[PDB]
Symmetry: C2
Subunit: 52 residues, 2 copies
Amino acid sequence: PHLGEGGALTGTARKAEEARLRRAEIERQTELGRLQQQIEQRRRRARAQIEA
Amino acid sequence: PHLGEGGALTGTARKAEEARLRRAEIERQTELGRLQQQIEQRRRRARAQIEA
């Protein structure tokens, strides 16, 4: 059975929709990872400054 | 025998001159030590900055 919104999709369209969902959710994960790395950088400067 | 400039000094004056010489040379040593510590400080900032 077709799972997810826009269930009318069938055939090649179903695979295309699956690929699009994978791409978008992957890039959302990349967004969150980049924010985490940003906070990483800020904390590094903070405690290095404390060391000085 | 009296050693050092102003050999005419005798009695208490000789001890006073010895004490004055000791004080002055000690403070010259303090001068040099303070300069060395200053360069100490500059080098510390330099390589800490390099670490960052």
